[PDB]
Structure 1
Amino acid sequence: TSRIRFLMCPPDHYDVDYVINPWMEGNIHKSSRDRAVEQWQGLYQILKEHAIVDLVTPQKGWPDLVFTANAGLVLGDNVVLSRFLHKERQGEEPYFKEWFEGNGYTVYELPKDLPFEGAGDALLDREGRWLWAGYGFRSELDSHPYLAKWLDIEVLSLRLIDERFYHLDTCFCPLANGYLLYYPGAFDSYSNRLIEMRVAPEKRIAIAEADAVNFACNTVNVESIVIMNKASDALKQSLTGVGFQVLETPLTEFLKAGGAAKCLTLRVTEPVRDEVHANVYVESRIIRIEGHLLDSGLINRALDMIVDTGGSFQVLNFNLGEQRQSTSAAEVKVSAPSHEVMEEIISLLIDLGAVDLPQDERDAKLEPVIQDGVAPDDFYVSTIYPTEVRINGQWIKVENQRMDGAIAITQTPNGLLAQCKILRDLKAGEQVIVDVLGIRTIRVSSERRVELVVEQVAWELRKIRDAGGKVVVTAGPVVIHTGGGEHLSRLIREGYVQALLGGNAIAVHDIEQNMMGTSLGVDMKRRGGHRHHLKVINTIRRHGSIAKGVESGIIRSGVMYECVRNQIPFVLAGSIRDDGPLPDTQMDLIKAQEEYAKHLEGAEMILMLSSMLHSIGVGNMTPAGVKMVCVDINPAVVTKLSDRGSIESVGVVTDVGLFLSLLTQQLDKLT
């Protein structure tokens, strides 16, 4: 009971016979039988030095039977048998079932065509506190509640987003003493947030891509021992630094099929805790969608949105309608890994006209406005489409519909009024709809050039910083969108920027990217909703300033963060398109022009990072003798600002994120 047992399976009939993951591609019948046996023996014999190893009898025509991690998932006397997505591994299931039965396990089986691929996609916390379950490529989200019930454990769902890392055990490895070895880039932003909420920074060992493509997460952790294919020096240092002994043993013949040390093993003695019981965060809701579904492609668009947003589905029924022109209807069970993700999904499906089944219809939830111009937490975000809300069992029409507002419910002489209002117009005492119930709708430069300018600009930046001179940066939202924010905030942190001029939008998107890993609802990990965006605006308005957001601890990193922490002055000039705005945004443009002008005094260099109108405005204010550096793909903010002569104005037409990336790289070369 302090004795650890693994199940393995020798490579007697192993080869790459087909392609069902990206590693197998190109590798059919390219496995060396001798090297495969010798590598498998290396792992097997290392494991026997530290644990018990049982073997499954190998079987002709089922080569991936060697990957026993996928046989199923054992906890105590129970096993959930794997159901494989691909037919090429489905033939393994009877032989795995046979072994589990022969060894006295109580075998649970999922519904046919509900994929789940065992310990390879679901990894126990090494203290047995919860089960981490993957979805996205092989196991279905809807298998997770079954795992929770049958194995009687809390299950946390993680969404995989990189096809090379198609099982959770390829990119995620709980270790002894609460440590976690994993590759963040394999997960979406939601999942990364969950990992970080559950595992303290000191306990997280995030690996680099070079280690990840060697299957360094595909590790067998016995006690203080970790066994794997190969580890970089950096990774070895990290692991030994917290007390693991690292054992390497080559498994490249098995990497040819997309597996390594952990895939080749199934731990069948797992820690069972008395106090641990079933807990499910997956939730689901049945919707109905109606119209010309096949013809309009509407059902296809709804399902794709559900999946792209992080959820899952099961079409429960689909009815054609019995005349050639008549509408169709589908009832769809929608699933989500959390309430947060469900709300994002249901919000999108509402626009498409999805509605509740009568039996499930509920009134809209309401919360009070307590501060003028601030909505209550989790307010629903309106769209452009005509909308009705259910109050006291009655559906009423929303007035003054407009996207990106809140819906306020008030009482009047002639009954209830539902009104779409922008955040700043909300008044203390109004009731605002929150959650998502009771809402429906009714229908150019070369490589040489860039590199030369980067070289020159980096040299000048380091030179000016070192002499204690003044650099002003102007920046537009494209810096954040394109992926350049971390580079900018680094410039600001390391002393290269003495003032930042911009608008409302760059501050909102930067704070958004840092709080939720999105920008306009786009996961930086690879369209999307406005909910994250409006939540940011509302949160900063409720605190009252960006700096109070930093002080309260809700802004922990990014461009605006570093400006606050290093006391770099910034000015946000308003525009006609501003959402909110943030409290910090100067909506009196006479004043904004004055504040710009004042911060421009004494500037030796102005770095304009695709800031468009702010760039023009700053050029107009700036005398000759100031070095101007203008970066933009819009090849004529560039030519309109590079008109002051070449000796003092330099222009590049290129992606500003790429430019910033090359710039910070070059600054490092100068040391």
Structure 2
Amino acid sequence: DIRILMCPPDHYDVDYVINPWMEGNIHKSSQERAVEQWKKLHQTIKECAIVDLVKPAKGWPDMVFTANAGLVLGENVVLSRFYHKERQGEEPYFKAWFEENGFTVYELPQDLPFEGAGDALFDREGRWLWAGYGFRSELDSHPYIAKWLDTEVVSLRLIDERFYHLDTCFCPLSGGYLLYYPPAFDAYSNRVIEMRIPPEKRIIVEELDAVNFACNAVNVNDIIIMNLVSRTLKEKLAEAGFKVRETPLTEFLKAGGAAKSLTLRVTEPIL
């Protein structure tokens, strides 16, 4: 069974600016359109996986972005500790959901930021965990995660403020494929990626797709769900065996997130 956690946009707005996509967008989201877009995404994901919901909290508009609730492996979750006070109030609500749903929760020190699956994505065969740092999660959190979850952690440094979470520019896929935007990473981190993923398994995104959040994609088996995709990228994905489903998420891009950011896979098998 594959299960994905989402959180509906009952209280969604753009109320502050903590990433560059939010600049100029305060109160520019339409709550009604956001509901419509989220409902279409929810339906599309539910066609591929079970969807669980956590009740949203008023005053925490970014709670829709459940990718940042924590990092799940098996029965364990490393709870996120947000870098910004504007999201720290989500933490007790996410903790309560994990506890109520049978997970055993690990908490980092309150001074050590780490933003969950948004910044840390497993290689889909379970060989290691790719973990971003540079804007939200601290590099020093990576050894904690490695030990708590008994996984090798491969740290990747983000260098572009637009691509401030790993999942905005990097997406492990089924079959060992990796969908990513190399310019979001420094040279050393690109070499680290390249050492592990050979060219035939790389699906390299160009900037025009990256800025439409193409890497912020939900992949269940051979299905990939995203906001918008160029024909060029759709054909590359089709050639690699994936079926692309697009669903519009413009109201969430105003807050710096798209399809993947609105999801957390809570069934991450031990392999």
Aligned to 1:198: 196
State how 1:255-270 maps to structure 2 within 5 Å. Answer: 255-270=253-268
Q: Distance in 2 between matches of 1:50 and 1:189?
A: 36
Aligned to 1:176: 174
Aligned to 1:209: 207
- Secondary structure in 2 aligned to 1:190? helix
Aligned to 2:22: 24
TM-score scaled to structure 1, two decimals? 0.40
**1:20, CA displacement in angstroms?**
0.5
Q: Deviations over 1:525-567 (max 9, x none)?
A: xxxxxxxxxxxxxxxxxxxxxxxxxxxxxxxxxxxxxxxxxxx
Aligned to 1:247: 245
Aligned partner of 1:35: which letter?
Answer: R
Aligned to 1:162: 160
Question: How many equivalent residue pairs?
Answer: 271
Q: Distance in 2 between matches of 1:82 and 1:267?
A: 15
Higher relative contact order (CA 8 A, sep 6+): 2
- Secondary structure in 2 aligned to 1:6? strand
8 Å CA contact retained: 1:126, 1:271: no
State how 1:86-125 maps to structure 2 within 5 Å. Answer: 86-125=84-123
Q: Deviations over 1:478-525 (max 9, x none)?
A: xxxxxxxxxxxxxxxxxxxxxxxxxxxxxxxxxxxxxxxxxxxxxxxx
Q: Distance in 1 between matches of 2:78 and 2:115?
A: 9
Structure 2 residue 233 is matched with structure 1 residue 235 = yes
Q: Deviations over 1:236-282 (max 9, x none)?
A: 01000111000000001000000000000000001212xxxxxxxxx
Structure 2 residue 217 is matched with structure 1 residue 219 = yes
Which structure is larger by alpha-carbon Rg, 1 or 2?
A: 1
State how 1:559-570 maps to structure 2 within 5 Å. Answer: none
**1:112, CA displacement in angstroms?**
1.2
Q: Distance in 2 between matches of 1:223 and 1:144?
A: 27
8 Å CA contact retained: 1:8, 1:55: yes
- Secondary structure in 2 aligned to 1:141? coil
Q: Distance in 2 between matches of 1:97 and 1:148?
A: 20
Aligned to 1:146: 144
Q: Distance in 2 between matches of 1:30 and 1:256?
A: 8
- Of 57, 60, 75, which residue of structure 1 is paired with 2:58? 60
Aligned partner of 1:19: which letter?
Answer: V
Q: Distance in 2 between matches of 1:201 and 1:271?
A: 27
Q: Distance in 2 between matches of 1:261 and 1:272?
A: 25
Aligned partner of 2:147: which letter?
Answer: K
**1:34, CA displacement in angstroms?**
1.2
Q: Distance in 2 between matches of 1:231 and 1:29?
A: 27
8 Å CA contact retained: 1:181, 1:206: yes
Q: Distance in 2 between matches of 1:94 and 1:130?
A: 28
- Secondary structure in 2 aligned to 1:263? helix
State how 1:55-454 maps to structure 2 within 5 Å. Answer: 55-273=53-271
Q: Distance in 2 between matches of 1:211 and 1:58?
A: 30
8 Å CA contact retained: 1:183, 1:212: yes
Q: Distance in 2 between matches of 1:17 and 1:242?
A: 40
Aligned partner of 1:50: which letter?
Answer: C
Which stretches of structure 1, 4 residues or more, deviate above 3 A after TM superposition? none
Q: Distance in 1 between matches of 2:207 and 2:245?
A: 20
Aligned partner of 2:217: which letter?
Answer: T
The Cα RMSD (Å) is: 0.5
Q: Distance in 1 between matches of 2:31 and 2:136?
A: 27
Q: Distance in 1 between matches of 2:17 and 2:76?
A: 32
Q: Distance in 1 between matches of 2:174 and 2:99?
A: 30
Q: Distance in 2 between matches of 1:223 and 1:15?
A: 32
TM-score scaled to structure 2, two decimals? 0.99
8 Å CA contact retained: 1:127, 1:271: no
- Secondary structure in 2 aligned to 1:158? strand
Q: Distance in 1 between matches of 2:207 and 2:145?
A: 31
Aligned to 1:631: none
Q: Deviations over 1:143-163 (max 9, x none)?
A: 000000111111000000000
Q: Deviations over 1:273-299 (max 9, x none)?
A: 2xxxxxxxxxxxxxxxxxxxxxxxxxx
- Of 31, 36, 39, which residue of structure 2 is paired with 1:33? 31
Aligned partner of 1:185: which letter?
Answer: P
- Secondary structure in 2 aligned to 1:195? helix
Aligned partner of 2:197: which letter?
Answer: V
Q: Distance in 2 between matches of 1:129 and 1:257?
A: 32
- Secondary structure in 1 aligned to 2:171? strand
- Secondary structure in 2 aligned to 1:271? coil
Q: How many percent of aligned residue pairs carry the same amino acid?
A: 81
